[PDB]
């Protein structure tokens, strides 16, 4: 009989996971209801998996999802109404179906720009209110800002159409829409990172200055088991809560790989490298613990390494990121810290 890994922070905060909807029965099931208390859609949320075409919205996924954390008591977080990625190409697309960001004249591109608005207020709307009873803590624009994209905003459809009106909008539809108890959030990667962090941080700085509800940032942290240092990640976190916002650790995951690394463990994987995650876990832990009262929530972007993006991303590999084995069994880094 192993401790339960939210049992373990129960004094600190909820620890979380990704999920998908397949998981909710059988064993790997029973490993989400014994070791965290809250969870996220790893794909059923996003805008590909709830709109796939306009006005023919899919929610069985996002629903089973749902209920799933309510029969089991487990806290939910919305991921992600707005993201570059994932996102079906309609929405982009004027009345003749061409590209907007291809419009040159100016009046249509004006038409373009109140059309793309419009539908992203019906959306949220639509997604909103179907939630908003459930879903206290929403992710409402993902990865909106790209150091290398002039200006520092990622230079996508949404910000070539609107500039950074869609993300004042999102805000203030899914505010709107879902009432002043919900908790909304600007997520993003390698916030720990000075440069993206300080643009992250003047955008939201002028926002929140502006009026846009902003009520914390998500810190995806998606890290490795060599970068980046635990005080970068602090720091930032630090930062935010000085403009009074919240901060969640949203999809933490460690891969065994540096960033310039393509090389393949296989089955194997070395002893050293496993404890070297677990030492990493251990120190992100101790750090996080001592934040708590700037950090609301830590989730994992998945529970078992039989599941992970890392295992295929940047390439088709075997990877390590969790707690937990391909057999659901507990790791170094579990035991790290549950029992440092």
């Known amino acids: 009989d192993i401790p339960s890994l939210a049992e373990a922070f129960r004094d600190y905060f909820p620890i979380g996971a990704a999920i998908e909807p397949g998981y909710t029965t059988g064993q790997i099931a029973e490993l989400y209801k014994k070791h965290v208390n809250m969870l996220v859609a790893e794909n059923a949320m996003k805008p590909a998996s709830l709109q796939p075409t306009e006005g023919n919205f899919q929610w069985a996924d996002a629903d089973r999802i749902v209920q799933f954390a309510k029969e089991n008591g487990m806290e939910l977080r919305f991921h992600t109404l707005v993201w570059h990625n994932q996102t079906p190409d309609w929405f982009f697309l004027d009345k003749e179906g061409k590209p907007m960001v291809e419009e040159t004249d100016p009046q249509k591109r004006e038409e373009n720009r109140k059309l793309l608005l419009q539908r992203l207020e019906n959306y949220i709307r639509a997604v909103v209110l179907r939630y908003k009873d459930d879903i206290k803590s929403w992710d409402v624009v993902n990865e909106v800002i790209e150091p290398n994209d002039p200006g520092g905003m990622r230079n996508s459809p949404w910000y070539q159409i609107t500039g950074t009106e869609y993300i004042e909008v999102a805000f203030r539809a899914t505010r709107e829409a879902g009432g002043s108890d919900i908790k909304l959030y600007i997520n993003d990667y390698n916030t720990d990172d000075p440069v993206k962090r300080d643009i992250l941080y003047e955008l939201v700085k002028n926002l929140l200055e502006k009026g846009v509800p902003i ?13 980046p240092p635990v005080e970068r990640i602090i720091e930032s976190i630090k930062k935010f809560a000085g403009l009074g916002l919240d901060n969640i650790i949203t999809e933490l995951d460690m891969s065994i790989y540096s960033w310039n690394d393509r090389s393949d463990y296989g089955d194997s994987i070395p002893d050293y490298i496993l404890t070297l995650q677990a030492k990493r876990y ?30 295929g991303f940047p390439v088709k590999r075997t990877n390590a990121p969790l707690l ?17």
């Open 215 to 227: 009520d914390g940032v998500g810190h995806q942290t998606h890290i490795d088991i060599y970068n």
């Open 282 to 311: 251990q120190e992100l832990f101790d750090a996080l613990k001592e934040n708590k009262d700037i950090v609301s929530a830590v989730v994992f972007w998945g529970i078992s390494d039989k599941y992970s993006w890392l295992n």
């Open 324 to 340: 937990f084995d391909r057999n659901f069994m507990p790791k170094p880094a579990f035991w790290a810290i549950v029992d440092p």
